[model samples]
Each structure stands twice: as C-alpha cells, then as structure tokens.
Target chain A: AKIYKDEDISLEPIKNKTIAILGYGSQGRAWALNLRDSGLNVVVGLERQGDSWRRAIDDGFKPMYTKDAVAIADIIVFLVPDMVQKSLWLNSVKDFMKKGADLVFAHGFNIHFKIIEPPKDSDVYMIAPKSPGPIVRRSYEMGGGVPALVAVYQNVSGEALQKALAIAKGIGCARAGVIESTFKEETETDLFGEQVILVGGIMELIKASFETLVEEGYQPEVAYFETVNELKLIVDLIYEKGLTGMLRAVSDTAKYGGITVGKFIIDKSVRDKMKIVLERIRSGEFAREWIKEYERGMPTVFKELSELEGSTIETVGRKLREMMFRGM
Target chain B: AKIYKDEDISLEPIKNKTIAILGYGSQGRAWALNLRDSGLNVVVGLERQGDSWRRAIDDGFKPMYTKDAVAIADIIVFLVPDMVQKSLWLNSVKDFMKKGADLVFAHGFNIHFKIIEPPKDSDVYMIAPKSPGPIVRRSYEMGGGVPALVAVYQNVSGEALQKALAIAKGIGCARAGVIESTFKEETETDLFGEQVILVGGIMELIKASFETLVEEGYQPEVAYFETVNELKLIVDLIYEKGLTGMLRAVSDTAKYGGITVGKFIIDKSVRDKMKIVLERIRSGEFAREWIKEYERGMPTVFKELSELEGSTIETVGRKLREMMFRGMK
Candidate 1:
C-alpha cells in the first residue's frame, strides 16, 4: 500500500537534514546505533539523569534534553513508551519545533489517534520495525536489518515522503526492504498484533497448553518442556522456513495433529475474539482505555505486575537454561 | 524424582571393566567422548565395513568390529538405532558375550517390548540422558551433567545395579545426580512424552496459532511473527524463568489472556484427547503400529519425510537466520 501523503510522495526533500532520536530505550537505542553506524548525523536525546544518560555520554554522543534535541535537529523522533509521549510533548518538547521539521515515529499510537497532535509547521511520519529490540540490534550488527513499516501522516513539509525514505535508509531498513503503511494501519496493526498474537494470543496459548498438560497429571518439568521449552526449536524452524516448513521438521503424528486436531483446538471462537480486538484498536477504544488506565496511576497494572513478579515459569526456566548451557 | 534404580548406587561393580560403546550417532558419539574423557576404558564398536568405523578411527580411537568390541570389553553399551539393534545383536555380538557381561541401552523400546530379548547370562540396564547430542557433550565438558534416568531390567550377574552406577559415574552423570526409574516407566514416559507433548502437542499448538491468524486475513509475515517469531522470546523467557517467570516477563494483556483465554483454548477436550494418546502408548498399540509400518516398507514414514524435505518453515527460517546474519541478497 502507498502509505505516504499525496503532497509528500517522494524522497527529494531529505537531501540535507539530521534525524535526532530522543531516548535510547530498547527501540531508540537500536535506531540511534544503527543510523549513526549507517553514516547519519544521529544524536541521542536524554535528560540529565539515569544510567541511560551516562551510557549515552560514554558512547561519545553529546546528549540533549527533549527541547534542545527537538529544536536543533531537522527531524525529531520520539522513542519513549506510548504512555509517556503525551505528557512529554505537552510539558517539555511541544514548543521547540523548527519550521518544516519532520517528526518521525517508530509507532503510531500518539499520532494515529490524535494523542499528541503536532503543530501545522512540522511533518509527521512513522517507521515501525517489525522485530523486537535485541533482534533489531543483532540483525543490524550482522549487517542485516529487520523489516519495517513506513507511513506519512501529515505532510506540512511537501517533502515528507522523501524524508521518510531517507530515515529508513539511515537505519539500514532499506537494505531489508521497507513496507509502506499508514499511521492508522500501523497503530491498529501493531496494537492488534500485540494484543491478539505476539503478546496476548501466543502467551495465552502457551499457558493453556502448559496448564492442560499439568492438570492431566504430567510432571511439571515434562509439561514445561512440552508446552514451552521446545517452543524455541519449533519456532526457529518456523522463523526460518514458515508454517509448512515448521510442520515438515516435526514428526508425522504432530503434523497430522496439527492439521486435524489443531483446527479444533484453536477454533472459530478465538479468531472471532481476535477480530474484536482489532476493531477495538481501529475505533481507538483501546488507546483511550489504555491512556486513561495509565493516567489513573497504573493500579491494575501494578497489581498484575506484582502477580507476575516471581512466577513459576521464571524459576523453572532459569534452572532449565542453566542446565542446557551445562550450568555455565 | 529419582531416575536411577539403586538407592546407594556405587561405581564399584564395573570399576575394572572396559565399556565398549557401539555406533557413533548422536547418542553414541556423545557417550563415547564423555565416558572416555571421564577416564573409562572405552572403545568404539562398528562393523568392519561401515564408514563410521573410519570416522571413529580418525577421532583417535581404535575401531573394532562389533564382535571384537564386545569380546574384549566387559560391558557393551548399544547406542545404535532401534531398527538396527536387533540385527546387530543377533548377527554379531550375541555369541561374543562373556559370562556375566553387562549390557547397556540408551533406549528401552526393543528390550522392554521383547523385540530384542537378550540372553539370560547378560546383565541388562539403561542409562539414557534427556537431551540432544550437543547438550550432552557440552554439559560433560563444563564439569556438569544432564540429568539421566537409570534402570536395571535384569540383574543376572548379581552386580548389574552396581555396574549401572559405575557406568553412570563414568559418563559424569552421577556427579550431578541420577534418578531411579523402571524400564517400563522409562519406556512408557519417553514415548508418551515424545508423541503427546514434545513432538505432537507443541507442533499442533504452533501450527494452529499460525493458521488461525492467516485464515483471519492477517499477513503471512504478521502471522509468522505472532505465532512463530514471538515464540523464541517466550521460550527464552521460559527457559530462564519457569512457566511463572515467563508469565512475569510478558505484558499484563498477555498474562490475563493466558490465564482466562488459555483455559478455554486448550480445554478439557484436549486433555481427554491427551489421555487417549497416553492410553494408546500404554497399550503398545502405537509401538506395534510403528513397527508394522516400518516392516511394511516404511511407506508412510518415507512419504512424510519426503513432504518435510522443502517445507516453508525451513526455507523461511533459513532466510530469516540469514537475514539476521545479513543475508538479504
């Protein structure tokens, strides 16, 4: 899909601009490191506190606070958590916009749903990389790059599209090929994926499988291996080959079970539930609920966090990994 | 739990005896290297005409024919595949057995099921490590050991249990610990686990999850991430933390979904189905079917194997790994 706005459908405008990335969390750090390594004038933005600030300094980049970072750069990319972007924009960096400054994002939550509307002077775009932090970093280090989705939301600077392409190249994403997407598409899809598959869907599947085995009187260790430990081996196959390839590496009984039993197991009900999840994202219900939830002091969030703090999977998995690595 | 037989197991019985490990496949090679490194008098046993014989010799060990390997050593550890073991035993080493010679097995499939019954004069036992070959070797090298299950099917020599313990010690298994198990329990659990959980259940879960997303009009790449790509992250978490720890590392949305939605997903229907799988194993129906299938020219097995030869997952995974290593071209 063509994800760029009509007025900014080309890369002719990014001939002279530096993309300054704010915050060096998992995603931000990877982008800064890759973009800098790719010969872009990428500066990291950080406050005067925390270990991250010190680390950035030691890494030889003169870090800036949000305002200074936004004011000085040709482009500003916010890489903070979804919940913090709004307040950060309102309290610190909103007024520091340079005219025609291109604002880029790695996610679409804030801009797509109007959480942090940018001023008319700046362009808005997004480049959400598909993989997680470590994979992104490792892949980049190996001279490879993860697949990313790009979209231009607002093109106040007629060359917004050009700027997006340049940013993608700076992070070595063009080397792996970039898919064009919209802020709405990126936000809805990313949130939907996290909720229904990557986080919510798969996590539930594993726990359900584990619980099923354990409740059936299998050993906890055995159940753990069946439901979780061996997941990596299978997924590694899938990641390399795809679904058909994954099934091929496994035993026939499993293949048969996958085709026959798996259909019944996942069922129509789950897919139906997933559609609802996507709809919630598309309608911005999830964003509003999530923002309000975060704003309300993260009450349920903390409660959930405490519950997961020392789960059994953690204890057993640690012991297992130690054993696998010969207790190294 | 205890996976070894003898309560006060000591390595005294086979202390002065040489152990001959036959074949150098995953199980054999690992056992040979580990046992040899642990100071046991170990020799590689292969048929004179086989290529592995040369490989064994090149690995700095004197290779001997099966008969020679058994005749010289006091204990023989058979690490060959299931289909090949009976023929190897009947054609070569059955007569070479010295009085009260110890026989070891890494799997109990043939013996416990009477597919390859041993002579009454031999002491038979099993010492199977629960891991792949690399892990087995890596563990031994690091001065640690993978947990193993030890069983004594027959103690004819009056020292079979002690011999098993000695062999376990020689393999560096006793240092970490050994659990006592029966040939029946070992054989049953191994098959049940492989068929139901390790190989069967997980494959089903993964494929089902992926297919569900694809059918729902999600991009194949997106489905891959949701079902397959994300799996490693969770598994890494699981391997580091127990089931609970994995839950802890994941976001609240996933966790809540796991507890509430997971219940309905796997459900009682699946558990009941698993019971049926266990029963099929316990009844030996599955084993008999597999053996018969193998004997009938292995049409089903070969067909399935051929199907997996160029699977999408394998291709995609290799490309992905290559991409991870910068293989975009």
Candidate 2:
C-alpha cells in the first residue's frame, strides 16, 4: 500500500480554491471547520431552515444555499447521506457548479454505484477519514489525525489526485498517513466491513449467545451479564492490546476454555457464510438491494428493526443496565 | 430469579465470627477490605514470603499462614484460583479448619468437581459477586454494590444459607441484590458463558473477520481497525444501553446493514454449537479436560497460547495501538 504522509503531500492545489462543504452534518461540519482552521477558504452549504444550517452559522461559517455555494466554489464536497445525494446533486447543485470545478465525497457509495455520475468537465475525488466526525475533529484538535483513504475517480484538470491529497492534508489526515485506494475498493470494503464484522457479525454473535443461555433455562439477567455486558470488557482489552493480550489478562480458566472451544463455536460454516456476505458486496448485490429498499420507503427494513428492538435480550438488557449504572 | 436485597439479609450470623480470607489476589483483597470496612473481623491468609503477604501487611492486616488462619476462623472464604485450590486445601488448610465452621467459595469449580470435599459437619456455600474484584471494591466504596450470586452446595448446619447471606451482606453485595442458585448451575453456566460467549466466541469472530479482510487483499491496518479496534465503541454503546440503543446511536446505514445481514453471518449452526458447548460444561466434560490439562502441567494449553501470541493480528495490533494511545496509561 502506498501511504502519503505530510512530507509527500502539498496544499498548493487547494490553497487558493473556495471549497464549499454541502450538508453540514457530522462529516460536513468537521471537514469545513478543519479546512478553515488550516487557512483555506471554506464555506458550508445547507438548506436555509434546518438545524445544520443554524449549527453552521453558530460555528461562524456564513452558510449559503447549496446552489449558491456550488456557483461560487472551486471545490464542492457532497457530504449528504447516500440515499439523498443523487437527487440533491441532480435537482439542485449540478447546473450551478462551474466547469472544471472539483466534486469531492467523504464516502464512495453514490459514486461507486454510479448513482451520481459527474459531468466530463469536472474533477471527482474522495478523501475519507476512517473515523467518525467527532473523532476526526477531536484528533485534529489534539494535533494528530485519524488516518484516511484518498481516491480519484475522474481528473479532468489532471490534478484530482493532488487535489484529494491537499484536502486530506488540510483535514490533518496527512499527519497520521493517508493511503491510496480506488473508489470501488473503498466503497466495497467499507460496506463489507460494516456488514460482515463490525456491526453485523458481532451483534448476531452476542444475541445468539444470549438466546442460547436463556433457552437453556438460565436467568435472563445472568444471561445478559454473561453474554452481553462482559463483552465490553473483553472487546476493550482486545482493542487496546490484542487477542493475545486479552487472553493473558483474563483468568487461566477463561483462556483455556476460550482457546479450546472458540473454534467449535465459530466453525467453518460461519467463515463460509462470511465469504458469501463479502461476495454479495463485491458483486454490488447488496447495494442494489439497499437502494431498492430505500426506493420502497424502507418498510421492510423498519419492520425488521422494530422486531429486533422488542427482543428479550434488549428488554432484559435495559433493566440490567439501569440497575448497574443508576445515578451515573 | 429469587432476589435478596439488603433488607432481606442479616449481618448477625457473621458479625461476631472471625473471618479468614485465603489468598490475596484480586478477589481476595477486595473482599477482605470490603468486609473489614463493613465492621466485620477480617484477616488474610497467605504464604509468609510472597508479594501478597507483604502487601497484606502494608494494608495494615496481620497476615497469617493458611493453616494458622484456618485454625482460628469461624468462617473461611476460599479465594484461591481453581487449579491450585485442591492442593492448597489438601496439603495445608483442611485439617486446620475448625469443626462445624462454615466454608465459603466465590466460585464453585473445586466443590462442584469434588476436587475438595468439606467435612460432613461443616457447611459449604458460595457468595460470588458477579463483577470482578476491582469493581466489587470500587462499588462498595461508592456506597453501592455489585450484584452477586449465593449458592449452597452442602448445608450440614442448616444455617449455611444464612451464613452465606451474612457474608454477602458483609461484602456489601446485598446492597444491590443477590440471586439464589445451586453450585451446579453457577459452575456450569459460568464456564459455559466464558467459553461460548465472552472470551471464546468473540475472539473467534474477531479473528475470522480480520482474516477474511486480509485474505481479500485489504490493508491489514485498515482491516484491524474495521474488525477489532472499532469493537470497543459498539460494545460500549451496547453495554450502557441495549442492542436497540446501540443501533439508535449508530448511522442509519449501519443499523440497517447490521440488522439485515447479522443473521446470515451467525445463523443457526453457531447457536447449535453454543448449545453443545453448554452441554459439555453441564456434563463436566470441560472440567475433566481442564483438570487433566492442569495435571499435565498445561502443556497443550501453553503451546496453543504461544501460537496465539505470535499471530499476525497481535503483531499488527501492537504497532497500531502504540500509535493510537501513545501517552495513555
């Protein structure tokens, strides 16, 4: 992997550019403020009435309408949610953007799925910090940075890659290091990671373990403590140190039990299933399905989520957490 | 599900009795200090020359040898590790224990497996605080208590349950709640929970996810962050609130994806394997295997642990963690 640090990047490409950050949400506000702090000309673009518009103004950015921001800026960062980006781009911002103006994204979803294809005269790029908005701002304020990924999809002016790096550097990601990737790679990997491991796999594992104990006649409170609450300690150890460090920190009985039985719990079949999940992401099947769900007003997704909200695990967990963290 | 709160328990059974805590490990020191603060007479039992013995003296306790402490106590709390408890009991502590004295355990392993059998005249019971030793101590100091489990293995004196409750009360666990359980249930469920969910299942899931990303040609650093580093945030949210609360805190995209694909990842086979793991614990198969391994100097266990220590995940994780928490303790 090619990693570009501070010494390898230059802010020249974006120095004199008027950068407009559209949709002053989490990522949007962070990027606009960081760039402004880095001595660049930055403006926030939002609808005239929402909380984000007021928030942008409170943070001292003279927020403009999305179309007006697009008309005046040399670089326009589209930071809206994926489901709304396409309609927003087509209906409001596209015609106002100048010829040869760069279009940027913090995520690759709409671009990779061809939901928002840019005009031939424009530069399109991505500079995605690998953390949430709060962390991005906090890390930069602490004189460090969350690492980021930089990708260029189109370079009409032949400096899209350089322009992306400049934005990454302005946001302080260059201090930590920025890696080069393609839009396709970032979009697919991000989707797969979120679905198969970070959110999807871990949550299911916790729920399944809790359910198994409950089904076997264990007390729901005990089951919740064992299967869910204790996971935070284990995962914290793993996060700070590693699997080895976590094992070493726990009791010998736990170490022995875990090593001996872990495989039996997450066996070959799970790995095979993980591969299928990955393949669907790689093949763009998940993206198509999600987009279709969005088109249908997300009825199925909302219903499923509601059902999950009412599970016994959630109910028991609520009571236990209230007991444990009372007055805190 | 029978809960006993502070009002339900009495300190009468233990207030006048001498309490001896064997071992000065995490659980040992916490219980001793908390019990002492609760106006009970508490003494620590340890070997004469080790760190614990010296530490006990520093903490203002006149520590005694195991046999000596056991000889004088009316109630003896065994806080030693499971693997060494048998030898400690057989070689030194047992004969010195007074006749008809109540014997206590924080975990039921040794008793449930018959590794150490108390005399027929004495009572055997357990009063285990569910949290670890440090939290148990901290909670008490904060005027609260970590919840605990109370179980009776043998009630020779018929007041074993009362004695156990008194001890739990002394350690401040009764302030929160105490749930009734049997030695067999606590031992089996504790083992099953650790192996199948807390330690075992989560570790495997993390490793598998990391390996999958790495094998698919993603950067190892990125994969580590995605699969391992970010778990803390997700779990902390889940811990403070429930799963539903966690979903609410995260992005809509994440919540939608997680709920939709979670089933496909864990599926039915994993639950089936969890049941098997539980069954093995219930049948004492796991205990037998662990005992055999311990008796054999843990050759297989150490060898596997060594390999785990040398895994690629650990190697990369160390470097990344240094960068993330450079000045943190």
Candidate 3:
C-alpha cells in the first residue's frame, strides 16, 4: 500500500547487527555480498562445506555451519528454496537462533503457511527483490537495484518495517522502488501468478497449441518452432514494451489475428478457471496440497514431468534446438 | 514434408539470374545482401529515395525504382509487408515484370488469398526464413543461416521449386535447413500460430490475470510485475531450455503449482476454440476478414489498438520499465 525509496530508509536500524545469510544459493549469496558491501556486518551459514560454502568463501565471506551462524547473528535471512527452508528452519534454525532477532525471507511460503512459526519475540519481515539474485547483484554494482516488495508479518521490534526497508536499500532495491505489501498478498499473488499465468498458463498454452498443430498433421519440428520457440522474442517484446507495443511490432496481419482471436481463446471459460485457481491459492488449498506432495516426494510432479519429457514437443524441440544452436 | 540442407541444394538455379529485391525492408535488404554475397547478382528496388534507398546504397547495392528493377530482373522477390504488397505488385510490378521471371515471397498472404494474380508464365514461390531479417542477416554472416520454409505455389516455368531452393541456399538458409510445404500450409500455419499462441493467447492471458489480481484488490503495480514483467525470465528460460527443462529450474513449489494449474487453466475449453481459429485460417475466412479490414484502412485494428494503448497495463508498464533501466544507460 506504501512505497519506499532510498530517501525513506536508513542503515541505522541494524548498523552494528550481524546479518546471517542462512542459505548461499542465488538469492542468499547476492544478498550477503550486497548487504556486506552496504557496510553491514554479515555472516554466511550453510549446512555443509560443499559448493555453496565454497562459493561463499570464493565471494570473500567466511560461512559457517547454519546453527553456529544462527547462534551469533542478530538477524537471519532465509534465501533457500521453499521446501528446503522447512527442515532447515526446524532443525538448524528455530532452537539455536539468537533471542529477539529479526527473521527475513525472500519468499513467504513457510511463514504464510505456518510451516516455520518463528519465536514470538522475533520481528518477522520480507524484502523480496523482484528479480533473480544475479540481477540483484549486477544491478547494484551498476548503481541501480531492481525493484522489490517489502512486507512485515510480525513487527514486535516496532522497527520491523524500517529494518526491512533498510535491507531493501542495502541490496540497492530503493534505487528503483520498494512496494509495501503483506505476507498474505505476496504469498497469494505469487502462487496465483505462478499457477494461473507464469509457468502454468503459458506452458499449457504452448503445449496445447503445439498439440493442436501436430494433430492437424503439421510437422512437430515446425510446430515447435511456431508455438514454443518463437515465443521467446514475443515475450521479450512484451516484457520490454508491454502488450500493445509488442503487438505493434509484429506484422499487422499477425497483430490483427492475435487481437481478434485473443479474446476468443482467452475467454470467459479460461477467466472463470483462473478465478478458481486464484481462489485455491488464496484459501491455501494449493499450499496444503503442495506440502503433502512435497512430503510424499512429489510423485505427481515427477510423473507429469517424465510424461512431458517424452512428449512430441519436447522430443522435437530437443532436436531443433540443437540444430539451431549447432553453430553457436 | 522433406528437408534440404546445403548439400541437398545448389546455387545453379538462380546463379545467373538477376534477382530484384522489391521493398527494401527487413526481409528485403537481408535477402539482397546475403544473396549477393552468395555469388548471385541481386538488384534492390524501392519506391522512394528514402532511408531504405539510402541504406541500400550504403550496403553496396545499386538500388533503383521497383518497375525499373522488375523490367530487367530474372527473379522478383516481394519482401514488403502483406498489405503493401497488394498495391506494389499491382501498380509497379505486374505490368513491368519480365516475361517468365520467378516471383518469390517471404510470406504467402497475398498469394494464398488470391489477392495477387501474377502473370501465367512466371514461377511463384516463397523462401521464408523463420527469423526476422536482422537475425537472418546476422546468422548468415555467422555462417549458420536460420531455418526456413520453402513453398512452391505455381511452377509455370517448370523451375519454380528449384529456383526457390537455390535462393534459399543463396541466402544461407541451407546452412541450417529448409522444410518443403505449400503456400496454403505456410500461410495457414503462420496466421494460426500468431492468432492462437504467440500474440493472442499469451497477451489475453496476461491481461486477464492482471485484471484478476486487480479485481481481487491487489495493487496494480504489484499485479503487473507478477503477471507481465516477470514473464521475461520465464520465457527466456523456456526458450533456452524447453518446457520440462525450464520447469526443472524453478522451485519445486512453483513447478508443482504450474504443472497442476496449467491444465486446469488451459483446458479443452480453450483448445477447442483454437481449433476453430485454425479452421478459420485454413478456410480463408479470417483472411477475407483481414483483407476487408486492411482495405478499410484497419479501423477495427486501430480502434482496438487505441483501446489497448489506453489500458492500465500499458501505462503502468511504461512507468515500471522506465525505472528498470534508469541507470543502465
């Protein structure tokens, strides 16, 4: 509901506090490096002295075991993937974490779904940069940061919002803007977007159209080029120029056809279905199902993925991609 | 369908022919440059001494008027836009074109829709590189041409297909490959894909989802970021890696959510409509309507475009995109 910029935040909230990065993956590593460079005392934590620990070392940080870092840090930032955070929080985090420390997350899955209920005395907040960590770091080094969303689920410190905004500024997000949202809005909208639009809607649309072309006796190779592969530039245009701008860049025939047919294809039927998907996400039904699916080793995800791997689009796409990139 | 690589094709068919590139646009200039570099004589034809004419001159081309080039050339390739081709062909091309010269096209719109009635003795065909002219030019210069589709609409000279294939090779398309198809197949498929997938389905889906979030009281700024801007990385992943490979890269939660909800959203309800859209393309119904639209100066298109241009997504998107590159420049 509110927006923050560099002028609205300061590093004084946790200027002397040790910020522990609980995971050293894309987001965690970037966060640690950028925050440290922002003059914060930071520590990297990992469960193993493996690739990630070595990466932290290479990036000029001494990352210790998760519990050790948690024991000494004044604030802990969870940058691990959604499912990995569950057990990491339960075993390595909750019991040994410093008293009254601030808890931070890039994604709000466990926090919103109650998978990892933090200590009552801790301040809980989120600083979600709307970009991959590599971009986060690169853009910061370039003196501008990607935009981010800041949310405060628990503000026991009374400075929860300020601290989150400062972290946003630390990672250089304030150069662009930091949107104020809630744990519920961020989680629900993220899930709904992933489900109804991002990976869900587009992937299905590609497959279904590919299937349609193949069913009509078009070559799978050519169909893949038309339906799946060419989408790269189209989406890139839309990303850079918005929908109308992209349509204008395409052929007029293509523009007209798409405009006229778009309404027909993404009609009331699909919109109604999207409503159901959004409802399911907001009601936490999808989270409950996903938790169970993860608990059961994700057989459904594994099964569908395998089935998809052998589909005509995938098989044809593999060959075509190799051919297209053969001289790259 | 048959595939032809460089080994399966030769420059013999068009080697000695003076190919005239009409309409020095993206496809036009690329075709001219690549063909000329491939040991074929190419002439560029343009209407005015505008930027294209200057560009042609800069590219080491002896550019001339369309009718002048058409009068002397052995092959005339129409690289103009679909609507522009109608007038260019009728006014400056048809009467002045050489006897029995091969007529080529990048897209088969006017040909397949019976809009252009070329002379009965000339060969008619298309050599459609799958990429835009810039990529086509770039890849060819890199010694790896983009893939293309070749279609022979009429072989009045008994050498239409061979000449088309030769031009494909000359443009360096044979370095990748070319698939054989008919004019109907190419036009129908191109229109259908544009309608059903690339611009149509995804654009509408983005608007609907963004609208859904807005209707649900979510902030328009945040909703636009989630539904519109974020698609760049996702599509980039899918383009670099196929669908399954891309899904494997995201979080398991996202993967599961997508795999499950994708089917629920893109159900048979949408695909059945896709079939109808495809049918319209195949049956020439959509083409008739488009022809009418273009003839009427595209009022419907402009109207809807104005509507779209006035949308919150477009306005909001410009604002956010401005910030994204604030310091990059």
The candidate scoring highest on lDDT is 3
i-RMS for every candidate = 5.0, 3.0, 2.7
Candidate achieving the largest DockQ: 3
Error in Å for residue A265 of model 1: 5.5
Tens digits of per-residue lDDT for model 3 on A1-328? 4556687788899899999999887678789989999999999999999999999999889889999999999999998878889799888998899889899998888899898888889999998877656667877887877778889999998999889999999999988778999898889888888888888888999999999999999877778777887787678678777887777666778878888899899988888888898888888898889888888999988998999999888888887777666553
DockQ sort, best first: 3, 2, 1
Q: How many residue pairs clash in each candidate?
A: 40, 0, 0
Against the true structure, what is each candidate's TM-score? 0.73, 0.83, 0.86
Per prediction, the TM-score for chain B is 0.88, 0.87, 0.86
Candidate 3 chain B least-lDDT 10 residues: B320-329
Shift in Å, residue B82, candidate 2: 1.7
Query: Over 4 Å off in model 1, which ranges?
Result: A1-24, A29-68, A109-123, A134-304, A318-328, B1-26, B29-73, B81-99, B108-123, B134-189, B209-230, B241-301, B314-329
The candidates' DockQ values read: 0.20, 0.42, 0.50
Candidate with better DockQ, 2 vs 3? 3
lDDT of 2 by residue, A204-299 (tens): 888888898899888887777677876775676677668877776566787789887888878788888778888888888888988888889877
Interface RMSD of 2: 3.0
Q: State the TM-score, rounded to 2 decimals, of chain A in model 1.
A: 0.90
Alpha-carbon runs more than 4 Å astray in model 2: A1-21, A24-65, A68-75, A98-102, A119-182, B1-20, B24-44, B47-64, B72-75, B99-102, B120-123, B129-147, B152-180, B327-329
